[PDB]
Write a protein that binds this ligand. Sequence first.
Ligand SMILES: *[C@@H]1O[C@H](CO)[C@@H](O[C@@H]2O[C@H](CO)[C@@H](O[C@H]3O[C@H](CO)[C@@H](O)[C@H](O)[C@@H]3O)[C@H](O)[C@H]2NC(C)=O)[C@H](O)[C@H]1NC(C)=O
Ligand SMILES: *[C@@H]1O[C@H](CO)[C@@H](O[C@@H]2O[C@H](CO)[C@@H](O[C@H]3O[C@H](CO)[C@@H](O)[C@H](O)[C@@H]3O)[C@H](O)[C@H]2NC(C)=O)[C@H](O)[C@H]1NC(C)=O
Ligand SMILES: *[C@@H]1O[C@H](CO)[C@@H](O[C@@H]2O[C@H](CO)[C@@H](O[C@H]3O[C@H](CO)[C@@H](O)[C@H](O)[C@@H]3O)[C@H](O)[C@H]2NC(C)=O)[C@H](O)[C@H]1NC(C)=O
Ligand SMILES: *[C@@H]1O[C@H](CO)[C@@H](O[C@@H]2O[C@H](CO)[C@@H](O[C@H]3O[C@H](CO)[C@@H](O)[C@H](O)[C@@H]3O)[C@H](O)[C@H]2NC(C)=O)[C@H](O)[C@H]1NC(C)=O
Ligand SMILES: *[C@@H]1O[C@H](CO)[C@@H](O[C@@H]2O[C@H](CO)[C@@H](O[C@H]3O[C@H](CO)[C@@H](O)[C@H](O)[C@@H]3O)[C@H](O)[C@H]2NC(C)=O)[C@H](O)[C@H]1NC(C)=O
Ligand SMILES: *[C@@H]1O[C@H](CO)[C@@H](O[C@@H]2O[C@H](CO)[C@@H](O)[C@H](O)[C@H]2NC(C)=O)[C@H](O)[C@H]1NC(C)=O
Ligand SMILES: *[C@@H]1O[C@H](CO)[C@@H](O)[C@H](O)[C@H]1NC(C)=O
Ligand SMILES: *[C@@H]1O[C@H](CO)[C@@H](O)[C@H](O)[C@H]1NC(C)=O
Ligand SMILES: *[C@@H]1O[C@H](CO)[C@@H](O)[C@H](O)[C@H]1NC(C)=O
Ligand SMILES: *[C@@H]1O[C@H](CO)[C@@H](O)[C@H](O)[C@H]1NC(C)=O
Ligand SMILES: *[C@@H]1O[C@H](CO)[C@@H](O)[C@H](O)[C@H]1NC(C)=O
Lengths: 49, 257, 383, 48, 49, 49, 37
Amino acid sequence: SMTKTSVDCTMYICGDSTECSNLLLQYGSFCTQLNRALTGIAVEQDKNT
Amino acid sequence: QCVNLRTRTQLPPAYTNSFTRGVYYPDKVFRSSVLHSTQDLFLPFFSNVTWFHAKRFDNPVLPFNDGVYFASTEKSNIIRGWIFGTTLDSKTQSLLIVNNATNVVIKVCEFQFCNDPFLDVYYHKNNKSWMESGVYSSANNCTFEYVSQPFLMDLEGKQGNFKNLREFVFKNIDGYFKIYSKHTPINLVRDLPQGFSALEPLVDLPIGINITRFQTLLALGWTAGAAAYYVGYLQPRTFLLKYNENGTITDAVDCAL
Amino acid sequence: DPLSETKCTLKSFTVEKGIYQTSNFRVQPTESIVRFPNITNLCPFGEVFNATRFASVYAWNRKRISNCVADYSVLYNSASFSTFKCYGVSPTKLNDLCFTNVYADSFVIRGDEVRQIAPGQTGKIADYNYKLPDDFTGCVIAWNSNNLDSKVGGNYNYRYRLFRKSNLKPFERDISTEIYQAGSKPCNGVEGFNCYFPLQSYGFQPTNGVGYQPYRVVVLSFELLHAPATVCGPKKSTNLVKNKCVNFNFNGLTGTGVLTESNKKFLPFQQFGRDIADTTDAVRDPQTLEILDITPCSFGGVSVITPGTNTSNQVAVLYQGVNCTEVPVAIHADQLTPTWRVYSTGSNVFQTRAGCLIGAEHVNNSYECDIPIGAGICASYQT
Amino acid sequence: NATRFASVYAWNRKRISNCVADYSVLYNSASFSTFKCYGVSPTKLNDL
Amino acid sequence: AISSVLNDILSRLDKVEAEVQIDRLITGRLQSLQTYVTQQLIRAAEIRA
Amino acid sequence: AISSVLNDILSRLDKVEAEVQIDRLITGRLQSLQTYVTQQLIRAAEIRA
Amino acid sequence: TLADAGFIKQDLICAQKFNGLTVLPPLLTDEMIAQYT
Ligand SMILES: *[C@@H]1O[C@H](CO)[C@@H](O[C@@H]2O[C@H](CO)[C@@H](O[C@H]3O[C@H](CO)[C@@H](O)[C@H](O)[C@@H]3O)[C@H](O)[C@H]2NC(C)=O)[C@H](O)[C@H]1NC(C)=O
Ligand SMILES: *[C@@H]1O[C@H](CO)[C@@H](O[C@@H]2O[C@H](CO)[C@@H](O[C@H]3O[C@H](CO)[C@@H](O)[C@H](O)[C@@H]3O)[C@H](O)[C@H]2NC(C)=O)[C@H](O)[C@H]1NC(C)=O
Ligand SMILES: *[C@@H]1O[C@H](CO)[C@@H](O[C@@H]2O[C@H](CO)[C@@H](O[C@H]3O[C@H](CO)[C@@H](O)[C@H](O)[C@@H]3O)[C@H](O)[C@H]2NC(C)=O)[C@H](O)[C@H]1NC(C)=O
Ligand SMILES: *[C@@H]1O[C@H](CO)[C@@H](O[C@@H]2O[C@H](CO)[C@@H](O[C@H]3O[C@H](CO)[C@@H](O)[C@H](O)[C@@H]3O)[C@H](O)[C@H]2NC(C)=O)[C@H](O)[C@H]1NC(C)=O
Ligand SMILES: *[C@@H]1O[C@H](CO)[C@@H](O[C@@H]2O[C@H](CO)[C@@H](O[C@H]3O[C@H](CO)[C@@H](O)[C@H](O)[C@@H]3O)[C@H](O)[C@H]2NC(C)=O)[C@H](O)[C@H]1NC(C)=O
Ligand SMILES: *[C@@H]1O[C@H](CO)[C@@H](O[C@@H]2O[C@H](CO)[C@@H](O)[C@H](O)[C@H]2NC(C)=O)[C@H](O)[C@H]1NC(C)=O
Ligand SMILES: *[C@@H]1O[C@H](CO)[C@@H](O)[C@H](O)[C@H]1NC(C)=O
Ligand SMILES: *[C@@H]1O[C@H](CO)[C@@H](O)[C@H](O)[C@H]1NC(C)=O
Ligand SMILES: *[C@@H]1O[C@H](CO)[C@@H](O)[C@H](O)[C@H]1NC(C)=O
Ligand SMILES: *[C@@H]1O[C@H](CO)[C@@H](O)[C@H](O)[C@H]1NC(C)=O
Ligand SMILES: *[C@@H]1O[C@H](CO)[C@@H](O)[C@H](O)[C@H]1NC(C)=O
């Protein structure tokens, strides 16, 4: 296995700003799609072990 | 008033390999237990500094470009200050950095300098210890002035029996001029020390002038004290700096050496 | 409630058995700290902007504003500035902000040259006698002064360098009067054909047209990399709290986090400390010379544990990576990113290895895993 | 700087060719109230 | 962007100028996550093997 | 950008206009390398298998 | 010589976590892998 990692795509990109987070929403589902991918990796580390 | 003393002609100057001297904190930022890279003007490691030793006296004119490292292994304070300029003859401005028994004075009036200028201890004159004007003649067009008090002071060290190394850096960028320094008691008779130390910043001022040349200033048919000083030229480099846990640069890599 | 936040994360009215991610929690700031140097004296903007006479561009003036309180609204609320363009800050934000130093440049030009004075421009003023850095931050200010600087015979004390061998470095000034060989022949002395004096008068007379009339110009060349600041807009500092989360502003470094008394010994030349991320993690307060650690206050993943909605509407919530000494500390008597405080009921709080689990009974009996929680824990629905 | 110029209905075109320009001798003039270039810098025209 | 620090952009600029700088930080950061998650998906397939 | 050739952009434009054109070439080229290296990492996993 | 096992935060690891990069626990702790083994 490897280390399970997840990222808050909003806290990484816009960390604690509302007025950045409203611009990040204009990029659609990209943050959710990254979170999904990292969750799929993280579940696979238990499947493997 | 020129006390013209051209006793000795231009001597082919001595040279000394500067091992790991010429590193300073690049900005007012605390950092700790981190290896940080910095593109900035620094003294290249293992580089030939010019070397000078004040019958033995020494105060030549030197070129200035990009910036300078200056250091001295000394006792009793003979090294007093610095001149900078472009023409040195009042076709352009020029500046003076004088230090004495305490204060520091800074001035950029359009000075005319004698061919062989320096500042002695004015024991007699019209009276004791007059203001350090005698390097120049005229000061009618002054665009900046500054003063400070606690600039450099000696170390107690059981009456200071060792020669105390004094290290400085002088630099300019886009109208600003900056100064950094450090001290260390050392036990080397005739050479610059192996080992490491960072220089802290001390002063900045906005001269707004071209600079192309500089010179040192020393005190006193006469007797005076003997001491060494060294000059290195800064260059644009990248250094990787190891900040220790206390946030002092403890080691560095000159990544073009 | 936490079940509803799963339904909108999955975008389904029913949810299968599992553990699911949802929007992160992050504890909100309780109140706002503001700190600036405890200076009080207002800056000398009058004589910087409304002195009796100003320098010619060949020897353009520089005055250093320092150790004082500005108020750039008292400037920008004036009608008198025909141009007031700022090139690395908004002119409105200047009050919420503080600077290492401010240099006020002052000079006079024909009203058509105000265009040349903006950063990275080019033209005879911008090339041979007054050049801004291309990376300049600051403001350019200008106004018409024909009704102040235009005596009927001609104000010929105002003048510009017509010729210069090469384009000058940013923020240089030149007072030399060297004669200029515009022809190939090496001229000397004082004058001759294509052997010009370098400095020429503006023809400023009160009958001149707009663009040929005299304009006073000021450039506020402020610098705001985080060296210890000396000129601030007018804002009241306030009492400094610790161990609570706050919005903070030190010298215009706005941020959010919890402050703490720090053993990080900044040397006297430093004021801010920075993390590997290029974010500040320590600060030296501008009113008490003391070093504070900044930690951005508690945040983590919120995962919801559910049987199927076709089995129950009970759910349990995992606050990932949290010592839930802070979960009951969160208490929605103030704001948070999640609104659902319902779970902070208590008497069920389990401090697990990978965070803290609210709303599930901890049992000493062991079973085969069902919903995985991490660090050896699983959850399941039973009698 | 010719004596008279065409009306916009029949706007004039002259072909500059087989010669050395100097767009600094133009752009160093004060006389041009507008001098905007739209696919080159007006300063670079000499290096080109 | 005129600074890498999101709060500085928001401190120095008003909304319509700030949006142009913040969008450069968002665009670059988002590409930095899409790179990380791609590298991690390709490592997850190696560890998976 | 007004040309695909980096030297033409630098020959025709002065610094503040050139930076806006050069940034479009940088952004597009960098995406072209990130694509190539991603394709090559995915081929490297096939060749590994 | 491991790094960031995600076992309760309260340094490189602290820098990473404070930017929204969290590390999750494995389902099976090192006692449970030792028991299976
Ligand atoms: C080191 O050199 C300094 C000059 O380079 C020198 O500073 C000068 O000191 C005198 C005496 O303090 C000052 O004289 C004036 O003092 C006050 C100023 O408000 C007036 O009331 C007096 O009438 C008198 O004009 C000089 O003005 C001052 N020069 C500067 C530039 O500040 C130091 O005293 C020297 N120190 C030693 C120990 O030699
Ligand atoms: C640097 O110092 C220079 C010497 O004082 C000074 O130049 C002098 O400028 C004044 C005018 O301010 C001239 O004074 C004469 O002005 C007109 C000229 O036609 C006469 O009608 C007057 O009666 C008066 O005599 C000086 O002649 C001139 N001297 C020289 C040698 O050029 C500079 O202005 C100073 N520079 C700065 C920036 O301060
Ligand atoms: C970071 O900076 C600290 C402050 O300078 C430094 O602490 C100092 O460490 C030395 C060496 O251990 C101590 O020296 C004394 O040690 C004992 C007493 O603890 C005496 O028996 C010795 O004779 C000697 O006098 C200093 O007392 C101590 N200073 C303080 C204020 O605690 C750290 O060691 C530095 N760490 C690094 C990695 O640079
Ligand atoms: C430029 O010179 C100006 C002339 O002295 C000076 O502006 C003057 O400032 C005072 C105080 O701000 C104004 O007084 C009025 O201020 C407000 C206006 O709403 C009222 O609350 C007061 O009761 C009072 O009426 C003057 O009106 C004003 N003069 C003008 C012509 O506007 C500036 O201070 C000078 N420039 C700088 C930078 O200081
Ligand atoms: C800062 O001061 C410098 C010293 O006065 C000055 O340097 C001089 O610059 C000019 C233009 O580059 C040179 O002029 C010569 O250029 C070539 C040789 O490189 C000759 O073919 C020309 O005919 C002409 O004589 C000078 O040679 C040069 N002098 C030195 C000692 O390097 C700078 O101009 C000043 N800085 C600025 C920004 O102007
Ligand atoms: C959760 O945080 C609290 C502190 O807020 C921890 O409590 C301390 O635990 C140590 C070790 O048992 C004791 O020596 C201290 O006296 C406790 N302090 C207090 C104020 O209770 C607790 O251990 C933490 N738990 C986890 C799993 O992180
Ligand atoms: C330094 O000077 C010495 C002579 O004193 C010479 O042998 C050496 O090669 C010089 N090195 C450089 C890089 O100048
Ligand atoms: C030194 O001499 C000057 C006259 O040159 C006199 O004005 C001053 O008072 C004297 N100071 C002392 C301390 O003797
Ligand atoms: C301002 O701060 C200083 C410390 O820098 C403090 O000693 C002083 O009491 C404060 N000023 C006032 C008016 O209290
Ligand atoms: C949902 O629950 C009903 C009984 O209420 C049951 O008949 C059905 O099989 C269940 N379906 C699923 C997918 O759980
Ligand atoms: C689990 O068992 C221990 C004794 O082995 C006991 O102290 C603890 O209170 C029990 N916990 C529960 C929730 O029953």
